[PDB]
């Protein structure tokens, strides 16, 4: 009875579905894919996912970040017959398989600093805004991308 | 499961035009990635252009020698590619296929944007552009001096065939792949080994080119 | 070629072989391998880091370092005399693709034979008609690897096929030499040499 997938996901949704960034059905996609081309990537600190269509049911380009008190079982991007423990996830709502590509590569050096992800599991809605907010600011090439404070929700 | 009929192939001529167009069945067309190859005479797979996805805005991607001269496209109510080519010219012959085209990223390791795959192919069509007209061939026979044969001499356009006997049906024929000369014309060679003895052997070859209506027989002797 | 792959390779049945393919490209860029057939569509075999379409068989897999990627075969059967190219991106960075120059692997599968060949002098009906061509036929041979000579080592107005296989699943090829009527009387006689692993050769004379 504790969180379940579905969950994450529709509520990660919510704020992108309220502000117009995809459509309404596009949480029961992502769930679609996440069945298919699973996004659990194991990490430093805490497991990650990247719940994420490749462009269909987009509108404009947009991320939703969210943080697990409790480790969920997402199975893992990569073949490991072992599931991810997720604590932090960033739903991607991008439409452009060229801008997609680009927004992962960054999601990468993001992960790849642990300390930031330690602070992530213990800060709040605006702490974790405005430091992924200066992030996308200081990442280079990064395209146009959508990310308000609703954005940032903590969930379980 | 998959498949993928080309068409629009054939005999054209220098400046001219043409369009490809490319079936395809099995699979989710209107969002795939679209590609056409094409494969010279003698030569290797060269990549030609590229069309995306709704999510990309059907953009498309050429190689630099046709970029301006080929435009590539897509009906995804009827699931047809096309490759429309203006200016064709020898050096654009070949044979062209369509490929389903896959999207490939690893996360750790890739760099965008990515690479890009060739999942599915088609059989292809076969797009010649010469100067040669048309050309009905000449035959002369190969006497024994026991190998004996007919020669195919300066045609145009493929194929040609041939039969011994008056469509005898005899074994031990063997027809050479034929030979596009320097001067843009085809010559090909039929052979069949007969008995050193069986004088009443009577052989004649017999050579057919619908292309040209051409039908001749050649009583070749030991001479 | 931004990628550059071996023109041939050879191989033994039940042996092991890998291709290369080289280009800087490869150092950022993953490669894809396909298998080419005469008359066929290409297979695509592997592509990305460790990735086999279902249907390839297990003896195909790939691996990249540095500038260079490769395939390797492990069991080579004679189903996989073939070509293979490589594909990736031409740039680091580019929407655009590229294929290799490709690679002839012949997979060694059958006893030599040696080529049988057969040389006809320019038929009367064809010099009546005030043209000549000598035409020598090459049959049966085994591995496909003949080159054709035309007693003067001088040799012009050659035209000579690719070789092809029969269904003896031996190769056969041919060459054409064509010369003026009064060419085949002004020389002594012209002479057919084939090379096929180290030399049948067969002379035809103006009589
Ligand atoms: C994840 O799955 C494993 C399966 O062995 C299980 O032991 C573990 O309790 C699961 N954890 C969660 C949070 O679902």
């Known amino acids: ?156 | 499961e998959v498949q993928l009929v080309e068409s629009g192939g054939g005999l054209v001529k220098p400046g001219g035009s043409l369009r490809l167009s490319c079936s395809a069945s099995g699979f989710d067309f209107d969002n795939a990635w679209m590609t056409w190859v094409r494969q010279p005479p003698g030569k290797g797979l060269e990549w030609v252009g590229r069309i995306t996805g709704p999510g990309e805005g059907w953009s498309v991607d050429y190689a630099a020698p046709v970029e301006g001269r080929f435009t590539i496209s897509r009906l995804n109510s009827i699931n047809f590619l096309y490759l429309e080519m203006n200016n064709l010219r020898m050096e654009d012959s070949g044979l062209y296929f369509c490929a389903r085209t896959g999207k490939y990223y690893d996360f750790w390791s890739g760099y965008p944007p990515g690479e890009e795959y060739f999942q599915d192919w088609g059989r292809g069509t076969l797009v010649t552009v010469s100067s040669a007209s048309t050309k009905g061939p000449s035959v002369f026979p190969l006497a024994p001096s026991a190998a004996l044969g007919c020669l195919v001499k300066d045609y145009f356009p493929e194929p040609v065939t041939v039969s011994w006997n008056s469509g005898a049906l005899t074994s031990g024929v063997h027809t050479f792949p034929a030979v596009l000369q320097s001067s843009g014309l085809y010559s090909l060679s039929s052979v069949v080994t007969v008995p050193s003895s069986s004088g009443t052997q009577t052989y004649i070859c017999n050579v057919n080119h619908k292309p040209s209506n051409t039908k001749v027989d050649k009583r070749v002797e030991p001479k | 070629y931004e990628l550059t792959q071996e023109t041939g390779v050879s191989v033994a049945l039940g042996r092991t072989v890998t291709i290369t393919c080289r280009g800087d490209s490869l150092r950022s860029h993953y490669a894809s391998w396909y298998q080419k057939k005469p008359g066929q569509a290409p297979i695509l075999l592997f592509y990305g880091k460790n990735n086999r379409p279902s249907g390839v068989p297990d003896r195909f897999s790939g691996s990249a370092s540095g500038n260079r990627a490769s395939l390797t075969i492990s069991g080579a059967q004679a189903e996989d005399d073939a070509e293979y190219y490589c594909s990736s991106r031409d740039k680091s960075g580019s929407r655009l693709s590229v294929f290799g120059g490709g690679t002839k692997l012949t997979v060694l599968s059958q006893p030599k034979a040696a080529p049988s060949v057969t040389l006809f002098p320019p038929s009367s009906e064809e010099l009546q008609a005030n043209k000549a061509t000598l035409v020598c036929l090459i049959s049966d041979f085994y591995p496909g690897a003949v080159t054709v000579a035309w007693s003067s080592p001088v040799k012009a107005g050659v035209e000579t096929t690719t070789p092809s296989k029969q269904s003896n699943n031996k190769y056969a090829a041919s060459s054409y030499l064509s010369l003026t009527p009064e060419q085949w009387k002004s020389h002594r006689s012209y002479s057919c040499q084939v090379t096929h692993e180290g030399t049948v050769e067969k002379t035809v004379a103006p009589t």
């Open chain 1, 1 to 156: 009875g504790n969180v379940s997938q579905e969950d994450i996901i529709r509520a990660l949704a919510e704020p992108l579905i309220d502000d117009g960034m995809v459509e309404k059905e596009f949480a029961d996609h992502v769930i679609e894919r996440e069945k298919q081309t699973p996004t659990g990537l194991q990490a430093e600190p805490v497991g990650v996912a990247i719940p994420h269509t490749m462009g269909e049911y987009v509108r404009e380009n947009a991320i939703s970040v969210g943080i697990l008190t409790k480790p969920v079982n997402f199975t893992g991007w990569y073949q490991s017959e072992e599931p991810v423990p997720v604590r932090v996830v960033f739903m991607l709502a991008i439409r452009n398989w060229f801008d997609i590509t680009n927004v992962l590569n960054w999601i990468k050096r993001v992960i790849q600093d642990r300390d930031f992800m330690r602070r992530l599991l213990t800060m709040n809605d605006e702490e974790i805004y405005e430091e992924i907010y200066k992030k996308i600011k200081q990442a280079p090439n990064l395209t146009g991308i959508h990310f308000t404070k609703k954005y940032v929700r903590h969930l379980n």
